[PDB]
A paper describes a structure:
Importin‐α is critical for successful nuclear import as it recognizes and binds to cargo proteins bearing a classical nuclear localization signal (NLS), which facilitates their transport from the cytoplasm into the nucleus. Importin‐α possesses an α‐solenoid tertiary structure characterized by a deep concave surface ideal for NLS‐cargo binding (Fournier et al. 2013). Notably, the twist causes the concave surface to become deeper at the N‐ and C‐termini, resulting in what is commonly known as the major (ARMs 2–4) and minor (ARMs 6–8) NLS‐binding grooves, respectively. In this study, we describe a combined computational and biophysical approach to design TAF8 NLS analogs, with zero net charge, and test their ability to target importin‐α.
To validate the computational modeling design, the analogs were co‐crystallized with importin‐α, and their structures were experimentally determined by X‐ray crystallography. The crystal structures of A1–A4 in complex with mImpα2 at resolutions ranging from 2.11 to 2.42 Å were determined. The electron densities of the 10 ARM domains of mImpα2 without the importin‐β‐binding (IBB)‐domain were clearly resolved including the P1–P6 and P′1–P′5 sites for the major and minor NLS‐binding grooves, respectively. The crystal structures had the same space groups as the original TAF8 NLS/importin‐α complex and every amino acid was resolved for all analogs bound at the major groove. Accordingly, the analogs bury an average surface area of 629.6 ± 21.2 Å2 in the major groove. Superpositioning the four analog structures at the major groove showed that the sequences also share almost identical binding modes, based on the alpha‐carbon's (Cα's) as the crystal structure of TAF8 NLS. The Cα backbone of the analogs exhibited RMSD values of 0.485, 0.529, 0.487, and 0.513 Å for A1, A2, A3, and A4, respectively, at the major groove. The analogs formed a total of 8–10 hydrogen bonds, 1 salt bridge, 37–40 VdW interactions, and 1–2 cation–π bonds. Visual inspection revealed that although the side chains for K299, K300, and K301 residues aligned at the P2, P3, and P4 sites, indicating that the analogs also relied on the consensus sequences for their binding, there were notable spatial orientational differences for some other residues and the amino acid contributions for A1–A4 changed significantly from the computational modeling. Crystal structures of these analogs complexed with mImpα2 confirmed their binding modes, albeit the novel interactions formed in the modeling procedure were disrupted by DTT used during crystallization.
Author numbering:
A (entry chain A): 72 to 496
B (entry chain C): 1 to 9
C (entry chain B): 1 to 6
Write the structure that this text describes.
């Protein structure tokens, strides 16, 4: 009946002014937009249908047309920025926010979904959804004693939409909206559904991707322990956002970094730094770099947890981008560590893999590695062991490469190269 | 992702 | 000991 209609037929029905004919045509439109085979979004837009669908959202008397119009508008808003803009320009936002109060749960959910697509377009639409007052009605739908009594699909859609209201920078969401949402997010981060957890962690990852003040809002709510627990999960869709959030947090102050350490995070990194997913290894090594950039007592906790051999490991063999983060982690460690800590690092075998990476075709990593050699030499100078280190570097193929680098395009390279040679070789 | 189509129900 | 974001 409502399968495989032309746009011309949908228009004729929608312009009928028979509410039932309009309902059938709206359903036909929804079925068009629901096909995965290149749905005719732009034809629907050009036919002038969006305003019609929008006004159908307000027909309380006819709940099916409300739902069918909601779903159609959801799928248009799922497209390009320009397609999302057509929906917004049609007045959909306040109309979807009204539908959040629908007594029919399927209609409520569809409105949640639509607003999620709208907010997910970018900061401007996110903030427009917020200005139209979406947050209160959204949070009201989660105001139950136990999240478990709500339908699974519904809770997941709400969580996802909330995560899109936390998403995007330039600018980041309004501080007062973030404060309003955070308590609910903390509750969702303790729910037992893998998908609710993943999206909750993504939200937290977004909120922590900013200056120390943004991080502090999150860290102050006491979520770091739960993030660390989630970091230990089996499901990669949970670990990925949890790790991103933990990594963001350690870009903050040393006191913010300490919360992560105090919550037990470092005990998961043996797995993370050997994880079979490239991205987890990269992001875990990146996280380590910002912990090695901390205080000496923090560096010492890295040492105590047994993670220096893991850094040696990643430096020795990983995707290049991971090895680059490992180089940073080492340079940070050597920059901030005590003499004893730098000695330990050399005893764990850092010299050969550092030297192997000077063959890299990446000017940045060379500068990072050269910095690290310098800092290590500085620690040797304080021990009168510049000779032993010189020999080690010579014996694993290092001197050759540092020499060659005295004749390198980049200035810092050739400079730091010649300084090392002349002082130590 | 950022946006998601509803495909059936 | 310079922290760097992403």
């Amino acid at each position: 009946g409502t399968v495989n209609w032309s746009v011309e037929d949908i228009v004729k029905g929608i312009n009928s002014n028979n509410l039932e004919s309009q309902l059938q045509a709206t359903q036909a439109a929804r079925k068009l937009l629901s096909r995965e085979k290149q749905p005719p979004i732009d034809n629907i837009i050009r036919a002038g249908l969006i305003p019609k669908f929008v006004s159908f959202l307000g027909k309380t008397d006819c709940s099916p047309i409300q739902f069918e119009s909601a779903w159609a508008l959801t799928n248009i808003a799922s497209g390009t920025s320009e397609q999302t803009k057509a929906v917004v320009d049609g007045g959909a936002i306040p109309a979807f926010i009204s539908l959040l109060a629908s007594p029919h749960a399927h209609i409520s959910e569809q409105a949640v979904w639509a607003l999620g697509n709208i907010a997910g377009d970018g900061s401007a639409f996110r903030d427009l959804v917020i200005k139209h007052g979406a947050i209160d009605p959204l949070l009201a739908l989660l105001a139950v004693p136990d999240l478990s009594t709500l339908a699974c699909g519904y809770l997941r859609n709400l969580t996802w939409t909330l995560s899109n209201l936390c998403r995007n920078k330039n600018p980041a969401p309004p501080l007062d909206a973030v404060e309003q949402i955070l308590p609910t997010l903390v509750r969702l981060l303790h729910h037992n559904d893998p998908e609710v957890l993943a999206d909750s962690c993504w939200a937290i990852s977004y909120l922590t991707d900013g200056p120390n003040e943004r991080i502090e809002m999150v860290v102050k709510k006491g979520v770091v322990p739960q993030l660390v627990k989630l970091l230990g999960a089996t499901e990669l869709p949970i670990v990925t956002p949890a790790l991103r959030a933990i990594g963001n947090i350690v870009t903050g102050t040393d006191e913010q970094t300490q919360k992560v350490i105090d919550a037990g995070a470092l005990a998961v990194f043996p797995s993370l730094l050997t994880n079979p997913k490239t991205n987890i290894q990269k992001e875990a090594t990146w996280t380590m770099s910002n912990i090695t950039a901390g205080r000496q007592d923090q560096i010492q906790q890295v040492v105590n947890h047994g993670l220096v051999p893991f850094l040696v490991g990643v430096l020795s063999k990983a995707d290049f981008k991971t090895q680059k983060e490992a180089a940073w982690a080492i340079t940070n460690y050597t920059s901030g560590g005590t003499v004893e800590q730098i000695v330990y690092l050399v005893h764990c075998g850092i010299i050969e893999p550092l030297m192997n990476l000077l063959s890299a075709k990446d000017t940045k990593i060379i500068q990072v590695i050269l910095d690290a050699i310098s800092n290590i030499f500085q620690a040797a100078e304080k021990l009168g062991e510049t000779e032993k280190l010189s020999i080690m570097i010579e014996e694993c193929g290092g001197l050759d490469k540092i020499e060659a680098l005295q004749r390198h395009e980049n200035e810092s390279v050739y400079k730091a190269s010649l300084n090392l040679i002349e002082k130590y070789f | 992702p950022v946006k998601k189509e509803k495909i059936d129900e």
